[PDB]
Coordinates of C-alpha atoms in Angstrom, one line a residue:
Chain M
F889 CA -0.1 0.1 0.2
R890 CA 1.6 3.2 -1.5
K891 CA 0.4 6.8 -1.4
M892 CA -0.3 7.3 -5.4
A893 CA -0.3 10.5 -7.0
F894 CA -2.6 11.3 -10.0
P895 CA -0.5 11.3 -13.6
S896 CA 0.7 14.8 -14.3
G897 CA 0.6 15.0 -18.0
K898 CA -2.5 17.1 -18.6
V899 CA -1.4 19.7 -16.0
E900 CA 2.3 19.9 -17.3
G901 CA 1.1 21.5 -20.8
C902 CA -0.8 24.4 -18.6
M903 CA 2.3 25.5 -16.5
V904 CA 4.0 28.9 -17.6
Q905 CA 6.5 31.2 -16.2
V906 CA 5.1 34.8 -15.1
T907 CA 7.5 37.5 -14.7
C908 CA 6.8 41.1 -13.5
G909 CA 9.7 43.2 -12.6
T910 CA 12.3 41.2 -10.4
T911 CA 9.8 38.8 -9.0
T912 CA 9.2 35.3 -11.3
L913 CA 6.7 32.7 -10.1
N914 CA 4.5 29.8 -11.8
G915 CA 1.2 30.4 -13.9
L916 CA -1.5 28.0 -14.9
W917 CA -2.3 28.5 -18.8
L918 CA -6.1 27.6 -19.5
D919 CA -7.5 28.9 -23.1
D920 CA -6.4 32.5 -23.1
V921 CA -6.1 33.2 -19.4
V922 CA -3.3 32.8 -17.4
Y923 CA -3.8 32.4 -13.8
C924 CA -1.0 33.3 -10.9
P925 CA -0.9 34.9 -7.6
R926 CA -1.7 38.3 -7.2
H927 CA 1.3 39.3 -5.2
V928 CA 3.7 38.7 -8.5
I929 CA 3.4 42.7 -9.1
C930 CA 4.6 43.3 -5.7
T931 CA 8.2 44.2 -4.6
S932 CA 9.8 43.1 -1.5
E933 CA 9.4 46.5 0.0
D934 CA 5.7 46.4 -0.9
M935 CA 4.9 43.3 0.5
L936 CA 4.5 45.2 4.2
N937 CA 1.1 46.7 3.5
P938 CA 0.6 46.2 -0.3
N939 CA -2.8 48.2 -1.8
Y940 CA -3.2 45.4 -4.7
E941 CA -5.9 48.3 -6.3
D942 CA -3.3 51.0 -6.6
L943 CA -0.3 49.0 -7.8
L944 CA -2.5 47.0 -10.5
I945 CA -3.8 50.5 -12.0
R946 CA -0.1 51.6 -12.3
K947 CA 1.1 48.3 -13.8
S948 CA 0.5 47.9 -17.8
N949 CA 0.5 45.0 -19.9
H950 CA 4.4 45.3 -21.0
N951 CA 5.3 44.9 -17.6
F952 CA 4.3 41.3 -17.5
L953 CA 6.8 38.5 -19.3
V954 CA 4.9 35.1 -20.1
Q955 CA 6.6 32.0 -21.4
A956 CA 5.6 28.7 -22.2
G957 CA 8.8 26.9 -22.8
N958 CA 10.8 28.7 -25.5
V959 CA 7.6 30.8 -26.9
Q960 CA 6.5 34.4 -25.6
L961 CA 2.8 34.8 -24.8
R962 CA 1.9 38.7 -25.4
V963 CA -0.7 40.0 -22.3
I964 CA -3.2 41.8 -23.9
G965 CA -5.1 42.6 -20.9
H966 CA -5.3 42.2 -16.7
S967 CA -8.2 41.5 -14.4
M968 CA -8.0 40.5 -10.6
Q969 CA -10.3 37.7 -9.0
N970 CA -9.7 38.1 -5.2
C971 CA -6.3 36.8 -4.8
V972 CA -5.5 35.7 -7.9
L973 CA -4.5 37.5 -11.1
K974 CA -6.1 36.8 -14.6
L975 CA -4.0 38.0 -17.6
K976 CA -5.3 37.5 -20.9
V977 CA -2.8 36.3 -23.7
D978 CA -3.0 36.6 -27.1
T979 CA -2.9 32.8 -27.9
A980 CA -5.2 30.3 -26.8
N981 CA -3.5 27.1 -25.1
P982 CA -4.3 24.0 -27.3
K983 CA -3.0 21.7 -24.9
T984 CA -5.8 22.9 -22.4
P985 CA -7.8 20.0 -21.1
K986 CA -11.4 19.6 -20.0
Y987 CA -11.1 20.9 -16.5
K988 CA -13.3 22.6 -13.8
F989 CA -12.7 24.5 -11.0
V990 CA -13.7 23.6 -7.1
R991 CA -13.0 24.4 -4.0
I992 CA -12.4 21.4 -1.5
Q993 CA -13.0 20.8 2.0
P994 CA -10.2 19.8 4.8
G995 CA -9.6 16.1 5.0
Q996 CA -9.9 15.9 1.0
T997 CA -6.7 14.6 -0.8
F998 CA -5.6 15.7 -4.3
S999 CA -2.2 15.7 -6.0
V1000 CA 0.6 18.3 -6.7
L1001 CA 2.6 19.5 -8.8
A1002 CA 5.3 21.4 -7.9
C1003 CA 7.2 23.6 -10.6
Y1004 CA 10.0 25.6 -10.6
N1005 CA 10.2 28.9 -12.8
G1006 CA 7.8 27.0 -15.1
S1007 CA 9.4 23.7 -15.4
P1008 CA 7.6 20.7 -13.5
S1009 CA 9.9 19.2 -11.4
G1010 CA 7.9 16.7 -8.9
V1011 CA 4.4 15.5 -8.1
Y1012 CA 3.4 14.1 -4.8
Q1013 CA -0.1 13.3 -3.0
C1014 CA -1.3 15.0 -0.1
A1015 CA -4.5 16.2 1.6
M1016 CA -5.9 19.7 2.9
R1017 CA -5.2 19.1 7.0
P1018 CA -7.7 20.5 9.1
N1019 CA -6.1 24.1 9.9
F1020 CA -6.4 24.5 6.4
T1021 CA -2.7 23.9 5.1
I1022 CA -0.5 21.0 3.5
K1023 CA 2.6 19.7 4.4
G1024 CA 4.5 19.9 1.1
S1025 CA 7.8 20.8 -0.6
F1026 CA 8.0 23.8 -2.1
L1027 CA 11.7 25.6 -2.2
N1028 CA 11.8 29.3 -3.5
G1029 CA 10.2 30.0 -6.9
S1030 CA 7.4 27.1 -6.9
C1031 CA 4.5 30.1 -6.0
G1032 CA 1.6 29.6 -8.3
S1033 CA 2.2 25.6 -8.1
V1034 CA -1.4 23.9 -8.5
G1035 CA -3.3 21.3 -6.7
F1036 CA -5.6 18.8 -9.0
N1037 CA -7.9 15.8 -9.1
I1038 CA -8.3 13.5 -12.3
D1039 CA -12.1 12.1 -12.8
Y1040 CA -11.2 10.0 -16.2
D1041 CA -11.2 12.8 -19.1
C1042 CA -11.9 15.7 -16.6
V1043 CA -9.1 17.8 -14.7
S1044 CA -10.5 19.3 -11.2
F1045 CA -8.4 22.0 -10.3
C1046 CA -8.7 23.0 -6.4
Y1047 CA -5.5 24.7 -5.1
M1048 CA -2.7 27.1 -5.6
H1049 CA 0.1 27.9 -3.7
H1050 CA 0.8 31.5 -2.5
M1051 CA 2.5 31.5 0.6
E1052 CA 5.0 29.6 3.0
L1053 CA 4.1 29.5 6.7
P1054 CA 7.3 29.7 9.0
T1055 CA 6.3 26.2 10.6
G1056 CA 6.9 24.3 7.1
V1057 CA 3.3 24.2 6.3
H1058 CA 2.1 26.1 3.1
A1059 CA -1.1 28.0 2.6
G1060 CA -2.9 28.7 -0.8
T1061 CA -5.9 29.6 -2.6
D1062 CA -8.3 27.7 -4.8
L1063 CA -8.5 28.9 -8.5
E1064 CA -11.1 31.4 -7.8
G1065 CA -8.7 33.7 -5.4
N1066 CA -10.7 32.4 -2.2
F1067 CA -8.4 31.5 0.7
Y1068 CA -8.3 28.2 2.3
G1069 CA -7.9 29.5 6.1
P1070 CA -7.4 32.9 7.9
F1071 CA -4.8 33.7 5.9
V1072 CA -3.6 37.1 3.8
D1073 CA -1.3 37.3 0.9
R1074 CA 1.0 39.8 3.2
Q1075 CA 4.4 39.3 4.2
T1076 CA 3.7 39.3 8.0
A1077 CA 3.6 37.3 11.3
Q1078 CA 1.2 34.1 10.4
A1079 CA 0.5 31.3 12.4
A1080 CA -1.2 28.1 11.7
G1081 CA -3.9 26.5 13.9
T1082 CA -3.6 23.4 15.7
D1083 CA -3.0 20.3 13.8
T1084 CA -5.4 17.7 14.3
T1085 CA -5.6 14.2 12.9
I1086 CA -8.4 13.2 10.4
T1087 CA -10.6 10.3 12.1
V1088 CA -12.3 9.2 9.2
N1089 CA -9.3 9.0 7.0
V1090 CA -7.8 6.8 9.6
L1091 CA -11.0 4.4 9.8
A1092 CA -10.8 4.3 6.2
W1093 CA -7.0 3.4 6.3
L1094 CA -7.9 0.7 8.8
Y1095 CA -10.4 -0.6 6.7
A1096 CA -8.1 -0.9 4.0
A1097 CA -5.8 -2.8 6.4
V1098 CA -8.5 -5.6 6.9
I1099 CA -8.9 -6.1 3.2
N1100 CA -5.0 -6.4 2.9
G1101 CA -5.5 -9.4 5.4
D1102 CA -4.2 -7.4 8.4
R1103 CA -6.9 -7.8 11.1
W1104 CA -5.2 -8.0 14.5
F1105 CA -6.4 -4.9 16.1
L1106 CA -10.2 -6.2 15.5
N1107 CA -11.6 -6.7 18.9
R1108 CA -15.3 -7.9 19.9
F1109 CA -16.0 -4.6 21.4
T1110 CA -18.4 -1.7 20.0
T1111 CA -18.7 1.9 21.3
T1112 CA -20.9 4.7 20.2
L1113 CA -20.8 8.1 18.7
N1114 CA -20.6 10.4 21.7
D1115 CA -18.3 8.2 24.1
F1116 CA -15.9 7.5 21.0
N1117 CA -15.7 11.2 20.4
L1118 CA -15.0 12.1 24.1
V1119 CA -12.2 10.0 23.7
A1120 CA -11.2 11.3 20.1
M1121 CA -10.9 14.8 21.7
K1122 CA -8.2 13.9 24.3
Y1123 CA -5.8 12.8 21.9
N1124 CA -6.8 15.5 19.4
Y1125 CA -8.5 13.3 16.8
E1126 CA -11.5 15.4 14.6
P1127 CA -15.1 14.4 15.9
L1128 CA -16.8 11.9 14.0
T1129 CA -20.1 12.6 12.6
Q1130 CA -23.2 10.6 11.3
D1131 CA -22.2 11.8 7.7
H1132 CA -18.9 10.1 7.9
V1133 CA -20.7 6.8 9.0
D1134 CA -22.9 6.9 5.8
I1135 CA -19.6 7.6 3.7
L1136 CA -17.8 5.0 5.6
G1137 CA -20.8 2.4 4.6
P1138 CA -19.6 0.6 1.3
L1139 CA -16.4 -0.4 3.3
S1140 CA -18.4 -1.7 6.1
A1141 CA -20.5 -4.0 4.0
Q1142 CA -17.4 -5.1 2.3
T1143 CA -15.5 -5.9 5.3
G1144 CA -18.7 -6.9 7.3
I1145 CA -17.2 -4.9 10.4
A1146 CA -19.2 -1.8 11.5
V1147 CA -18.1 1.6 11.6
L1148 CA -19.0 1.9 15.8
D1149 CA -17.4 -1.7 15.8
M1150 CA -14.2 -0.6 14.2
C1151 CA -14.2 2.8 15.8
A1152 CA -13.8 0.7 19.2
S1153 CA -10.8 -0.9 17.8
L1154 CA -9.2 2.7 17.2
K1155 CA -10.0 3.7 20.6
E1156 CA -7.7 0.9 22.1
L1157 CA -5.0 1.8 19.5
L1158 CA -5.2 5.2 21.1
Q1159 CA -5.6 4.2 24.5
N1160 CA -3.2 1.3 25.1
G1161 CA -0.7 2.2 22.2
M1162 CA 0.2 0.0 18.9
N1163 CA 1.9 -2.9 21.6
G1164 CA 5.1 -3.3 19.3
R1165 CA 3.2 -3.9 16.1
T1166 CA 2.5 -2.6 12.9
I1167 CA -0.5 -1.9 10.6
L1168 CA 0.0 -2.4 6.9
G1169 CA 3.8 -2.2 7.6
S1170 CA 3.6 1.3 9.6
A1171 CA 4.3 2.2 13.2
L1172 CA 1.7 4.8 12.7
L1173 CA -1.6 5.5 11.6
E1174 CA -2.0 7.1 8.2
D1175 CA -4.7 9.9 8.1
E1176 CA -4.3 11.0 4.3
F1177 CA -6.1 8.1 2.6
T1178 CA -9.7 9.2 1.9
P1179 CA -12.2 6.3 1.9
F1180 CA -12.6 7.3 -1.7
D1181 CA -8.9 6.7 -2.1
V1182 CA -9.4 3.3 -0.7
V1183 CA -11.7 2.1 -2.7
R1184 CA -10.5 3.4 -6.0
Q1185 CA -6.9 1.6 -4.9
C1186 CA -8.3 -2.0 -4.7
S1187 CA -12.0 -2.1 -4.9
Chain J
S535 CA 10.8 21.3 8.0
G536 CA 9.2 18.6 5.5
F537 CA 11.2 16.5 3.3
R538 CA 8.5 14.8 1.2
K539 CA 8.9 11.8 -1.4
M540 CA 8.5 13.4 -4.8
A541 CA 7.9 11.4 -7.8
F542 CA 8.8 12.6 -11.2
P543 CA 6.1 14.1 -14.0
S544 CA 4.7 11.5 -15.7
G545 CA 3.8 13.2 -19.1
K546 CA 6.5 11.8 -21.2
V547 CA 5.9 8.2 -20.1
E548 CA 1.9 8.7 -20.6
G549 CA 2.2 9.0 -24.2
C550 CA 4.3 5.9 -24.0
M551 CA 2.0 3.2 -22.7
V552 CA -0.1 0.8 -24.7
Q553 CA -2.1 -2.3 -24.4
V554 CA -1.1 -5.5 -25.5
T555 CA -3.3 -8.4 -26.0
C556 CA -2.6 -11.9 -26.9
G557 CA -5.3 -14.8 -26.6
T558 CA -7.4 -13.8 -23.4
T559 CA -4.2 -12.2 -21.7
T560 CA -3.9 -8.6 -21.6
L561 CA -0.9 -6.4 -20.1
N562 CA 0.7 -3.2 -20.7
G563 CA 3.3 -2.0 -23.4
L564 CA 5.9 0.7 -23.7
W565 CA 5.9 1.9 -27.2
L566 CA 9.1 3.7 -28.2
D567 CA 10.1 4.2 -31.7
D568 CA 8.3 1.5 -33.8
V569 CA 8.9 -1.0 -30.9
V570 CA 6.8 -2.2 -28.5
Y571 CA 8.0 -4.0 -25.3
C572 CA 6.2 -6.1 -22.8
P573 CA 6.9 -9.2 -20.7
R574 CA 7.1 -12.3 -22.7
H575 CA 4.5 -14.0 -20.3
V576 CA 1.5 -12.6 -22.3
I577 CA 1.9 -15.6 -24.4
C578 CA 1.5 -17.8 -21.6
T579 CA -2.1 -19.4 -20.4
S580 CA -2.8 -19.5 -16.7
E581 CA -1.9 -23.4 -17.0
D582 CA 1.2 -22.7 -19.0
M583 CA 2.6 -20.6 -16.1
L584 CA 4.1 -23.5 -13.9
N585 CA 6.4 -24.9 -16.6
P586 CA 6.6 -22.5 -19.5
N587 CA 8.3 -23.1 -22.7
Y588 CA 8.8 -20.1 -24.0
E589 CA 10.3 -21.1 -27.4
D590 CA 7.9 -23.8 -27.9
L591 CA 5.1 -21.4 -27.3
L592 CA 6.2 -18.1 -29.3
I593 CA 7.0 -20.4 -32.3
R594 CA 3.7 -21.2 -33.1
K595 CA 2.7 -17.8 -32.4
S596 CA 1.9 -15.2 -35.8
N597 CA 1.9 -11.4 -36.0
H598 CA -1.7 -11.3 -36.1
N599 CA -2.0 -13.1 -32.9
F600 CA -1.0 -9.8 -31.2
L601 CA -3.2 -7.0 -30.7
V602 CA -1.9 -3.9 -29.5
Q603 CA -3.9 -0.6 -28.9
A604 CA -2.7 3.0 -28.4
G605 CA -6.0 4.7 -26.9
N606 CA -9.0 4.0 -29.6
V607 CA -6.4 3.5 -32.2
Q608 CA -4.5 -0.1 -33.1
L609 CA -1.5 -0.8 -34.4
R610 CA -0.1 -3.5 -36.6
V611 CA 2.4 -5.7 -35.5
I612 CA 5.0 -6.6 -38.5
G613 CA 7.4 -8.8 -36.6
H614 CA 8.4 -10.3 -33.2
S615 CA 11.7 -11.3 -31.2
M616 CA 12.4 -12.7 -27.8
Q617 CA 15.1 -11.1 -25.9
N618 CA 15.8 -12.7 -22.2
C619 CA 11.9 -12.4 -20.2
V620 CA 10.9 -9.4 -22.8
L621 CA 9.0 -9.5 -26.1
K622 CA 9.9 -7.1 -28.6
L623 CA 6.8 -6.1 -30.9
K624 CA 7.8 -4.5 -34.3
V625 CA 4.7 -1.7 -35.1
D626 CA 4.1 -0.2 -38.9
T627 CA 3.9 3.2 -37.2
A628 CA 6.6 5.1 -34.8
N629 CA 5.5 6.5 -32.0
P630 CA 5.4 10.3 -32.7
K631 CA 5.5 10.8 -28.6
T632 CA 8.7 9.2 -28.5
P633 CA 10.9 11.4 -25.6
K634 CA 14.7 11.3 -25.5
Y635 CA 15.1 7.9 -23.6
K636 CA 17.8 5.3 -22.5
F637 CA 17.9 2.3 -21.0
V638 CA 20.1 1.7 -17.8
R639 CA 20.1 -1.0 -15.4
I640 CA 20.2 -0.1 -11.3
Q641 CA 21.4 -1.2 -8.3
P642 CA 20.1 -1.8 -4.8
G643 CA 19.1 1.4 -2.8
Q644 CA 18.5 3.6 -6.2
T645 CA 15.2 5.3 -6.7
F646 CA 12.7 5.7 -9.6
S647 CA 9.2 6.9 -10.3
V648 CA 6.6 4.1 -11.1
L649 CA 3.7 5.0 -13.3
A650 CA 1.2 2.2 -12.6
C651 CA -1.4 1.3 -15.7
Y652 CA -3.9 -1.0 -16.1
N653 CA -5.0 -2.2 -19.8
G654 CA -2.6 0.7 -21.3
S655 CA -4.0 3.1 -19.5
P656 CA -2.1 5.2 -16.2
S657 CA -4.0 5.3 -13.1
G658 CA -1.2 6.7 -10.5
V659 CA 2.6 7.6 -9.9
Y660 CA 4.6 7.1 -7.0
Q661 CA 8.3 7.2 -5.7
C662 CA 10.2 4.3 -4.9
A663 CA 13.8 2.7 -4.1
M664 CA 15.2 -1.0 -5.3
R665 CA 15.3 -2.8 -2.1
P666 CA 18.5 -4.8 -1.3
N667 CA 16.6 -8.3 -1.9
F668 CA 15.8 -7.1 -5.3
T669 CA 12.1 -6.1 -4.9
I670 CA 9.9 -3.1 -4.8
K671 CA 7.3 -2.0 -2.4
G672 CA 4.0 -1.0 -4.0
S673 CA 0.4 -1.8 -4.8
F674 CA 0.3 -3.5 -8.1
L675 CA -3.4 -5.6 -8.5
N676 CA -3.6 -7.7 -11.5
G677 CA -3.6 -6.2 -15.1
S678 CA -0.6 -3.9 -14.2
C679 CA 2.2 -6.3 -15.3
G680 CA 4.1 -4.3 -17.7
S681 CA 4.7 -0.9 -16.0
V682 CA 7.6 0.5 -16.4
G683 CA 10.1 2.6 -13.8
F684 CA 11.6 5.7 -14.7
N685 CA 14.2 8.5 -13.6
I686 CA 14.0 12.0 -15.6
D687 CA 17.1 14.0 -15.9
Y688 CA 16.6 17.2 -17.8
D689 CA 14.7 16.3 -20.8
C690 CA 15.9 12.6 -21.0
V691 CA 13.8 9.6 -19.5
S692 CA 15.9 6.7 -18.3
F693 CA 14.0 3.4 -18.0
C694 CA 14.9 1.2 -15.6
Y695 CA 12.3 -1.3 -14.7
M696 CA 9.5 -3.7 -15.7
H697 CA 7.2 -4.9 -13.7
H698 CA 6.6 -9.1 -14.0
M699 CA 5.3 -10.8 -11.2
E700 CA 4.0 -10.5 -7.7
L701 CA 5.3 -12.7 -5.0
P702 CA 3.4 -14.0 -2.1
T703 CA 5.0 -11.9 0.8
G704 CA 3.5 -8.9 -0.8
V705 CA 6.7 -7.9 -3.1
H706 CA 7.0 -7.3 -6.9
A707 CA 9.7 -8.3 -8.9
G708 CA 10.8 -7.3 -12.5
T709 CA 13.3 -6.8 -15.2
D710 CA 15.6 -3.9 -17.0
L711 CA 14.2 -3.0 -20.2
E712 CA 16.7 -5.6 -21.7
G713 CA 14.9 -8.6 -20.4
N714 CA 17.1 -9.4 -17.9
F715 CA 15.6 -9.8 -14.0
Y716 CA 16.7 -8.2 -11.3
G717 CA 17.5 -10.7 -8.4
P718 CA 17.2 -14.4 -8.4
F719 CA 13.8 -14.7 -9.9
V720 CA 12.3 -16.1 -13.0
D721 CA 8.8 -15.8 -14.5
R722 CA 7.7 -19.0 -13.5
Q723 CA 4.7 -19.8 -11.1
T724 CA 6.6 -21.4 -8.7
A725 CA 7.9 -21.3 -5.2
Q726 CA 10.0 -18.4 -5.3
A727 CA 11.4 -16.7 -2.1
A728 CA 12.8 -13.4 -1.7
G729 CA 15.7 -12.8 0.9
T730 CA 15.4 -10.9 4.1
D731 CA 14.8 -7.0 3.7
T732 CA 17.4 -4.8 5.0
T733 CA 17.2 -1.3 5.7
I734 CA 19.6 0.9 3.0
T735 CA 22.2 2.2 5.6
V736 CA 23.8 4.5 3.0
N737 CA 20.2 6.3 2.5
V738 CA 19.7 7.2 6.3
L739 CA 23.3 8.4 6.8
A740 CA 22.6 10.9 3.8
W741 CA 19.2 11.6 5.4
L742 CA 20.7 12.4 8.5
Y743 CA 23.2 14.7 6.9
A744 CA 20.1 16.4 5.0
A745 CA 19.1 16.7 8.7
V746 CA 22.1 18.7 10.0
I747 CA 21.8 21.0 7.1
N748 CA 18.0 22.1 8.0
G749 CA 19.1 22.7 11.9
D750 CA 18.0 19.3 13.5
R751 CA 20.9 18.2 15.6
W752 CA 19.2 16.4 18.7
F753 CA 20.6 13.0 17.7
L754 CA 24.4 14.3 17.6
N755 CA 26.7 12.6 20.1
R756 CA 30.5 13.3 20.4
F757 CA 31.5 9.7 19.9
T758 CA 32.9 8.0 17.0
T759 CA 33.8 4.5 15.9
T760 CA 35.3 2.4 13.0
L761 CA 33.9 0.9 10.1
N762 CA 34.2 -2.6 11.4
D763 CA 32.8 -1.7 14.4
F764 CA 29.7 0.0 13.2
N765 CA 29.1 -3.0 10.8
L766 CA 29.0 -5.3 13.6
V767 CA 26.3 -3.5 15.4
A768 CA 24.7 -2.7 12.3
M769 CA 23.9 -6.3 11.4
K770 CA 21.9 -6.7 14.7
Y771 CA 19.4 -4.2 13.3
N772 CA 19.3 -5.7 9.8
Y773 CA 21.1 -2.3 8.3
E774 CA 23.1 -3.1 5.3
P775 CA 27.0 -3.0 5.6
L776 CA 28.5 0.1 5.0
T777 CA 31.7 -0.3 2.6
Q778 CA 34.6 2.3 2.0
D779 CA 32.5 3.3 -1.5
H780 CA 29.9 4.8 0.6
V781 CA 32.1 6.5 2.7
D782 CA 33.4 8.7 -0.1
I783 CA 30.3 9.1 -1.7
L784 CA 28.8 10.8 1.7
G785 CA 32.2 13.0 1.1
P786 CA 30.5 16.2 -0.1
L787 CA 27.7 15.9 2.7
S788 CA 30.5 15.5 5.4
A789 CA 32.3 18.2 3.9
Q790 CA 29.6 21.0 3.9
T791 CA 28.9 20.2 7.4
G792 CA 31.7 19.6 10.3
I793 CA 30.7 16.2 10.8
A794 CA 32.8 13.6 9.7
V795 CA 30.9 10.0 8.2
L796 CA 32.4 7.7 11.2
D797 CA 31.1 10.3 13.3
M798 CA 27.8 10.3 12.0
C799 CA 27.8 6.6 11.9
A800 CA 28.3 6.6 15.8
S801 CA 24.9 9.0 16.0
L802 CA 22.9 6.4 14.0
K803 CA 24.6 3.4 16.2
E804 CA 22.8 5.5 19.2
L805 CA 19.5 6.0 17.5
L806 CA 19.2 2.4 16.8
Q807 CA 19.6 1.6 20.4
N808 CA 17.1 4.5 21.9
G809 CA 14.9 5.4 19.5
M810 CA 13.4 8.7 18.7
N811 CA 11.6 9.2 22.4
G812 CA 8.6 10.8 20.6
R813 CA 11.0 13.2 18.5
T814 CA 11.2 13.7 14.5
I815 CA 14.1 14.2 12.3
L816 CA 12.8 16.6 9.4
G817 CA 8.9 16.1 10.5
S818 CA 9.1 11.9 10.1
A819 CA 8.7 10.0 13.1
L820 CA 10.9 6.9 11.4
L821 CA 14.2 6.8 9.9
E822 CA 13.9 7.3 6.0
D823 CA 15.9 4.9 3.6
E824 CA 14.6 5.7 0.3
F825 CA 16.6 9.2 -0.3
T826 CA 19.9 8.5 -2.1
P827 CA 23.0 10.5 -1.4
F828 CA 22.7 12.0 -5.0
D829 CA 19.0 13.8 -4.4
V830 CA 20.1 15.1 -0.8
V831 CA 23.3 16.5 -2.8
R832 CA 21.5 18.2 -5.3
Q833 CA 18.8 19.4 -3.2
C834 CA 20.9 20.6 -0.6

């Protein structure tokens, strides 16, 4: 069992490099529009308290340099949508895929194509943490890298990298410029909230372990929602809702283990520990596999 | 903090994946130029798997017995030849999406990206390392035979692995692109035993060197040790022995930092005997042995 990432072929052809003055980052080229973080128009001095309205009116069309590999794209207009910058180009992208803009909720997974100066370098799978941050590997020049999901022929763009929080986590927006979490695109002291474990993803991972034949942690006890939740709050586990039970229903029928039945197994794992054992070869309980991910992997 | 396992972009490989069907058997193929590469056991039924006579099976096949599909477009096989455990199908059409490619054979401990595909359609990509017992860790359900492993350098793609079989312990075995098997395995449905899997010691040391550069230093001690002394202790933890070759490879890492390689070995010895005590190294609660010294040096 491994954390698989979606193939990145349809996204690699949409990545471009956007230069404005002395700042260069990554841009998403779809149809005849290039999307990039709005702070590309800011100098280092302006990052303290920028007024993006006054800086954008001063800027003109020839202040933006957009490059798609070896060719040069001509900007014929600029527009601002929340925290994202929309640049109109003269030539439409012939590699534009079937795509849609969507906003996801914390706990959902997606793949990230990390690009440096318009050149893709790596891809990995991650989940939106409950504090609206992502644990990724973005060095300098990776701003504007996009997160995505693939549904057959349709690519769903759901994230764009904006900032780099000092704790190591990163913060971003959706493709419509709406930020994930209480952050602003300013160079100030910002702190991500307390990170917590996604309980529903752990249960889906535990169900995948039973599918793989590993069922030593199963016991004869079953708990209820309120009793398990009080235990969950103690060790910083996200509260379990009724909607989580129905979402995990298909995994319950296949393995034959009820959601509340498996909940008592997770409760014992948090209380008495692992007892020097392993689950799928891991000494820790993974929480970056959504229930939909588990079904896709095997069933 | 944060040193994530990143995989290479798979775009240049996705256009090379095709579907090969012979009789009732179907797996994945690699379409480079005007040649299609696929495992040779595609000419086998479930009954022939116990004791396959590949020379006898292949002599009875004609060109029209192989069906090759690239998307909705079907390719015409005009010839075929066997090279070790791989089948080379010549086709009338050269692949227009062929990138700059090479064939390289890899050693244990090195890393590559795997593109998992089912019936010629890519499904997911992940990063892995070649274990010292010549197996790989992953999730390849049936129909994924023929998936390739690769590294990308600049614009050149280096193919190094082709998935062939599924060992009964959960690990997977395969060959290089010339059809030569990795490790002591054959394309037979018989009792094949993989050796004990050991931690890649040189990869852990390079990972720990990257930890020192990023500011993590809680595991350092003032002690030093010799190569033979560290090796004797290392075997007790199922750790791969360290050789004089590994010492010079880590030389640039031990040059940027102030820690000698044998000094770093002493710290690793103390970690094994003690544990992490709830701490983390680069955001990881466990020692990582899937980052090569080359990757650490390049990424600094």
